């Protein structure tokens, strides 16, 4: 884990602490843990979208480097599809 990845991780955790409610933190922890234990990237994206909707764009963009290589393309397609990079 590089120094830059370390920085990104710290930044992400801080942003989570600043932005999310206890409930949101619990839900994200749950769905992320499910994905970590072997659940599909598809279900991960569904759960993320159900959690954030069109909001929390920063937190979705920040996940991209963390997505495993084999699931990265699906995640990018997801972000592009739901319009995370589209402000208006």
């Amino acid at each position: 884990l590089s120094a830059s990845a370390t920085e990104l991780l710290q930044d992400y955790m801080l942003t989570l602490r600043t932005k999310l409610s206890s409930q949101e933190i619990q839900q994200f922890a749950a769905l992320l843990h499910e994905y970590r234990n072997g659940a599909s990237i598809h279900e991960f994206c569904i759960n993320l979208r159900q959690l954030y909707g069109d909001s929390r764009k920063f937190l979705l963009l920040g996940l991209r480097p963390f997505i495993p290589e084999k699931d990265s393309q699906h995640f990018e397609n997801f972000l592009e599809t739901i319009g995370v990079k589209d402000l208006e």
């Binding site: 955790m13 602490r17 963390f66």
Partner: peptide
């Protein structure tokens, strides 16, 4: 439990790379 959830999140984020 919120702190534990945060620790879980960080741990899982690291684990996805390992």
């Amino acid at each position: 439990d919120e702190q534990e959830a945060l620790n879980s999140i960080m741990n899982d984020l690291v684990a996805l790379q390992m």
